[model samples]
Target chain A: QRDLSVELGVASNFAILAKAGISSVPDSAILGDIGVSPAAATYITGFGLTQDSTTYATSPQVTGMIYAADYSTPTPNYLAAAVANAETAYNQAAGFVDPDFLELGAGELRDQTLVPGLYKWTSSVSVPTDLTFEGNGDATWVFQIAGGLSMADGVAFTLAGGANSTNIAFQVGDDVTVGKGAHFEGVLLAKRFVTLQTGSSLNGRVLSQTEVALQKATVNSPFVPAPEVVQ
Target chain B: QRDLSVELGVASNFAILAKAGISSVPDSAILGDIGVSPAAATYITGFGLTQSTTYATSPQVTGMIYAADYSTPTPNYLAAAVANAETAYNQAAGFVDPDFLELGAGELRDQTLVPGLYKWTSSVSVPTDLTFEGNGDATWVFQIAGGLSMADGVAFTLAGGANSTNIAFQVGDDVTVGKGAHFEGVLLAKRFVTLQTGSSLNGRVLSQTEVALQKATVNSPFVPAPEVVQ
Candidate 1:
């Protein structure tokens, strides 16, 4: 068993797994049998990785690091010791972000401004339907949606401090879509993709999501144009 | 045991805990004693709470929502419940960042590009040493004296692409300075901050650490006109 050592540097590189756009595997893909380890690669960067293979490399921006696994036998054992270390490190590292759950149905944009914290929903609340919200003043509403969440359209969510302070944070959640013929204000922190129709407008940032496709829409915030690049 | 619901008009001030600089707690904080359940708060609105409050407000951040322990005592008990909720969320978030520990005493100078986990031993590492000595191919170091600071009389240097590729301190370490000196670089260590002597930092931003710049110089990578401290 390798005791956790402190020092490390760039090592030899290998073209083991030739996945074209392969950087870090999604948490869902980690459930599979195939694995990679950072220790076997050249320079593993980024943060927020969970699987045993991706656990070797460490970075704040990206999670987890993985490369091809090497075994004593040609077949490479089904389970490698490196996987265990990665798993342990993954569990230990994930404990910091603090996960929360919130579910928002329809309702008035009641509060003027919201702070940073965990928020999960119970029923399918509506915006301006089951719920109605009027911008308290001109500020935007910021929500750190960690768990599953839903937002109805026609919800005029606003971030008063213009655009800079209007930011939302999320870890993992379900499908979130704006209402048709309706517009939404404020930022979203959903791990899933964001699909906006023609007349929709959003102000804020989305850290990680499945995919984002905008149609006849305008984004007032600066979003990472490239997925592979980390800032 | 309470459900909060409200409707604030556009351009009208309904609730005021909006700015990050301002303390979320109100002047005469409301619901100080009564605790609101996470579920209730999640569904309700205009919930102005304190660290000691239990109930949550509507449109809350996922991390801020929490479940309260009904089994606990009456009156001021929500504070403890909210704290518990935050604890659970923090753990899950921790996995995203990499932790790197180091063992050396040297300087990291120039635009030291770092996109990985890193740590240090005996505090400070040197940048001049790594640069002038060519410790690790084009690798300029920051002389982390003590935790994350460069010893006094050190001249700051910026190398590589900073805006695009930043040199981050992923480790939850601290950088302490002995006296005022020329400093440069974008520091992101999480802890207290100290600037010894008339430290002149030719960097863009300093984060996480609480800086006590004493008669030191402050410079920005983007700007040339350096700002001098008192």
Candidate 2:
């Protein structure tokens, strides 16, 4: 049996031992064969960790931790709504936003590649159908499309990334929130708040003029995560 | 000639107005057999639009009123460092957090994930090479694994979703805040201040502890939109 105690601060010089094995093996047997154990495993040594009545002598459990990161609070839900309402509620709200804000009514349609520039709506330009804005590079640029640029539910906004010119820099001076189950990709810079509801996918970096809220949302950044959790 | 000016508010409505008609004549015209003496095409007023030129006749375009949702204060670079240092130095400074912590010293086979509620028995349980990532759709519930906990600056921490589980992370007792890191998910209980960097989330749903998001970002359920002044 090996003394398997790890001190995060004290064990500065600890080495990671090697063990070559096949994947998907039962975790209990591996621990038994290894002749060592985790501190969380000690809890089950007495009480039965019953899941559907099947029991094990020792289990590979992640019995949680009681640390600084644990005392965190759930972010305010209405705060986003307030931020969203700020534009309509306060006069200063809509003042700084770009009124040329266009909504993708029919949905976004790219018949061919559109060159990067500030595009304004002659009117509320509805999508002819589902649209996509593919980019050529990661440079400072803007897509000033008109209307309340929106995508219908289940519609997708895919960023065509393949070349050195793959970055599409946007500065939307308006509110931009994706419909549930909607998919989009870009460097989304909003002058208001940006919200991605449950099951929504936004493959982009957002610097909201207000606040950005994510609910059951999965976010991945191409460069960095620009979220500042202020008090 | 179709008269287009009669329609009000309707700028330019066309179905197939620009198609070609080269071969078929309207039964009345040859280049020489002119009907009207002034030439029917000469009275047209508007010129074609091009990408390189701006139409001089059109009215100036009006944009949506611009307004900022979030306040754009001067950048706080050094303040961020001070805040993070306070979180880390305060808790993890001299004494280690003992509430409920774990240190992974063995191979993958050496540890078992203790299900249900747990509390950290120690401060920093650096898993080192052993990384702990969740595997199930259910929020991975983690309570203090064992032992009397310490204050590594971090106190009670939990992470979860709405209408689902209370946490992907579940703890057993009190926790603390550390240098700039995240203490996400729903908090069932607390005692110390829960510091944050500007960030927002959901599920305050409830708490037995005092919540402090200091200079941290917070978003309530209310939505933001454009409207009147004041």
**Best candidate per lDDT, number?**
1
Q: Native contacts retained per candidate?
A: 0.00, 0.00
Q: What DockQ does model 1 achieve?
A: 0.01
* Prediction 1 TM-score vs. true: 0.27
Worst 10 residues of 2 chain B by lDDT: B8-17
lDDT of 1 by residue, A159-179 (tens): 432333332322234445555
| Model 2 residue A224 CA deviation in Å | 4.3
Docking class of 2: incorrect
> Which portions of model 1 show Cα errors greater than 4 Å?
A1-118, A122-153, A159-172, A222-231, B1-230
lDDT of 2 by residue, A3-96 (tens): 1111111001001000111111112111111100111222222122333211112223212111110111110111112222222322222222
Candidate 1 CAPRI assessment class: incorrect
Candidate 1 displacement at residue A168 in angstroms = 4.2
lDDT of 2 by residue, B75-184 (tens): 11111212222332222212322222343421122233322333344322312121223333333233332211222223223223212222322223333333333333
When summed lDDT is taken over every stretch of 10 residues in candidate 2 chain A, the lowest stretch is A10-19
